[PDB]
Amino acid sequence: SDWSGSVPANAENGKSTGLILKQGDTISVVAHGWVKYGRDNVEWAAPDGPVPNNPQPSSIATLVAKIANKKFAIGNGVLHKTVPVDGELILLFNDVPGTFGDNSGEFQVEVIIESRYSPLK
Amino acid sequence: SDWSGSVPANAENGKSTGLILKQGDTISVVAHGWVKYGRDNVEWAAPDGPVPNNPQPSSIATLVAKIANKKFAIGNGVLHKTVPVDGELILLFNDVPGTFGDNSGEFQVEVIIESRYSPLK
Amino acid sequence: SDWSGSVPANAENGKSTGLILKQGDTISVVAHGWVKYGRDNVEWAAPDGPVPNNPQPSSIATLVAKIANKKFAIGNGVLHKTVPVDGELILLFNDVPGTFGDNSGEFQVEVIIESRYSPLK
Amino acid sequence: SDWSGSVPANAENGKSTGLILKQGDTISVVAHGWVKYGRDNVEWAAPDGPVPNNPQPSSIATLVAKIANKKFAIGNGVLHKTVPVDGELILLFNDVPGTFGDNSGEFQVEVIIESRYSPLK
Ligand SMILES: O=C1C=CC2=C(C1)Oc1cc(O)ccc1[C@@H]2c1ccc(NC(=S)NCCO[C@H]2O[C@H](CO)[C@H](O)[C@H](O)[C@H]2O)cc1C(=O)O
Ligand SMILES: O=C1C=CC2=C(C1)Oc1cc(O)ccc1[C@H]2c1ccc(NC(=S)NCCO[C@H]2O[C@H](CO)[C@H](O)[C@H](O)[C@H]2O)cc1C(=O)O
Ligand SMILES: [Ca+2]
Ligand SMILES: [Ca+2]
Ligand SMILES: [Ca+2]
Ligand SMILES: [Ca+2]
Numbered sequence: 001s002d003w004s005g006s007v008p009a010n011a012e013n014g015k016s017t018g019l020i021l022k023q024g025d026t027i028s029v030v031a032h033g034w035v036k037y038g039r040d041n042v043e044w045a046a047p048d049g050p051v052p053n054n055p056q057p058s059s060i061a062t063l064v065a066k067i068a069n070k071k072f073a074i075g076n077g078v079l080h081k082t083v084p085v086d087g088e089l090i091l092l093f094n095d096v097p098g099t100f101g102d103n104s105g106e107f108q109v110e111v112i113i114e115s116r117y118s119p120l121k
Numbered sequence: 122s123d124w125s126g127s128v129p130a131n132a133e134n135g136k137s138t139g140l141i142l143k144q145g146d147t148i149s150v151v152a153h154g155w156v157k158y159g160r161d162n163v164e165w166a167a168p169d170g171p172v173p174n175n176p177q178p179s180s181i182a183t184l185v186a187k188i189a190n191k192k193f194a195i196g197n198g199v200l201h202k203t204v205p206v207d208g209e210l211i212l213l214f215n216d217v218p219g220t221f222g223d224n225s226g227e228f229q230v231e232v233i234i235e236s237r238y239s240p241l242k
Numbered sequence: 243s244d245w246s247g248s249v250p251a252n253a254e255n256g257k258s259t260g261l262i263l264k265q266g267d268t269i270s271v272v273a274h275g276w277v278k279y280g281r282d283n284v285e286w287a288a289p290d291g292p293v294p295n296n297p298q299p300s301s302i303a304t305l306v307a308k309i310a311n312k313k314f315a316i317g318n319g320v321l322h323k324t325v326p327v328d329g330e331l332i333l334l335f336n337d338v339p340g341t342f343g344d345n346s347g348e349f350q351v352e353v354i355i356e357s358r359y360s361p362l363k
Numbered sequence: 364s365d366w367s368g369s370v371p372a373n374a375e376n377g378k379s380t381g382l383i384l385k386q387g388d389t390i391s392v393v394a395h396g397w398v399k400y401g402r403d404n405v406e407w408a409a410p411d412g413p414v415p416n417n418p419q420p421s422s423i424a425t426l427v428a429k430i431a432n433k434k435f436a437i438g439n440g441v442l443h444k445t446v447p448v449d450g451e452l453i454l455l456f457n458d459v460p461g462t463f464g465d466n467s468g469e470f471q472v473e474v475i476i477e478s479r480y481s482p483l484k
Contacts, residue, residue, distance in 0.1 A: 026268065052155050116364075119325075121315055203481065235443075236389055237443075240445045243442065274438060275411065276411075284416075286416065293397070318409070
């Protein structure tokens, strides 16, 4: 793939992929595994977010993509989505700022750049 | 996409997609959401499988693909995987046979046929 | 493929493919074979255009895509190009208006819709 | 693209792309432009081969791919084709051996590795 690696739930600044994206690129992502967003036995999350028996605020404790400090939903993954801004791709477990210290585990994520922007001319 | 729909957790025979696959095709799948594989408060499953605070045997209670009565791991998703046998793609919550009655909920799944088999000649 | 067929050189209005494209879709095309853009034995064209021993004006006698009555270069083919406007894909041998009567032959063309527009959100 | 560049018609050993393909990968290629396979005014060829008013033996003076010292037709291009052998992708103007000395020009070729072999399992 274009990048595969682990996304630690404790990394408040997320994980750098080294992928530089341009508006109009298309990408696909899949994410596997389990993390904790708190020490309580219930505070598990898949990339899609917290287990529904303990919901958290909108988009919190979900896997997101940061592109140039814009934030996009990813969750368990996306297929052939258009990149709407230029920027480096950072993957982030979107916990509340300052609450990462009780997080543990990591997701295994694959990213494919399906295409680089080139328009019909 | 080529197919998008829900896959009920209580469907012992899965969800038929109507996608007729051939050996050599390649597909991508992403799966979102949550299901219950049992009545207990901890018996939640992502497509990847049960939440690890109540682990189940390998592959059990995970989203799988059935093609020609063969099962293949899918989980939260797969990217550009080659199909090894002809048959219609069936999406299945791979619970223990006979234990589908205590299941509820459904996953939301998208399937893309990335390519139809054609070799260099 | 999504569409495969022949594009006749003598069709002043091109060949309608039935592929309804939206802005943001991406497509790939490959074009094979040879056509006559005139009755002389020198007036041969590949999809990229006239054989350069009898050159014609820019874009003339080349395979182009017509979408929303706008013309885009295709030639021998394109890979993963972004569609800039909505409309049915029309494949056109781009001969001088009024000069299609002395044309003959057809290209063998394949089109794949690589993705349907869907932005990260 | 994974690789793009020129394929000189006078290169008897073709052009090495540095793409190391594996059996089960899929690729797309498109090739543009015109070359001479001889010094006479009619000995032009597109990637699909010579202009048909001076036809040459089958596959001669076409753009082919060499992988594992086997030969595959490419021509003006191919979409999402499965690679049947392991090797580096070599792009070659398939002139009769020993007759490259009267060739000139080059095709402009783009190659995309559409996917790397990974089966459903
Ligand atoms: O160093 C050597 C190089 C070549 C050959 C050597 C030694 O020895 C022998 C000994 C033999 O007993 C018989 C043949 C050969 C050699 C050979 C010489 C010419 C041709 N084709 C000829 S003349 N006309 C077809 C139209 O011509 C155009 O198309 C061509 C492609 O079809 C080329 O691109 C050519 O450039 C272009 O003008 C074939 C052969 C062969 O090998 O089959
Ligand atoms: O019976 C009739 C026969 C011919 C013509 C008739 C009636 O009426 C009109 C009325 C007008 O108002 C203007 C022109 C014509 C007639 C005509 C048509 C074509 C050309 N040549 C041109 S443009 N470029 C030279 C290379 O030509 C090749 O390439 C071309 C693309 O570049 C095309 O594909 C062409 O087909 C192919 O041969 C000249 C005339 C003319 O007579 O000037
Ligand atoms: Ca936390
Ligand atoms: Ca159960
Ligand atoms: Ca004409
Ligand atoms: Ca030659």
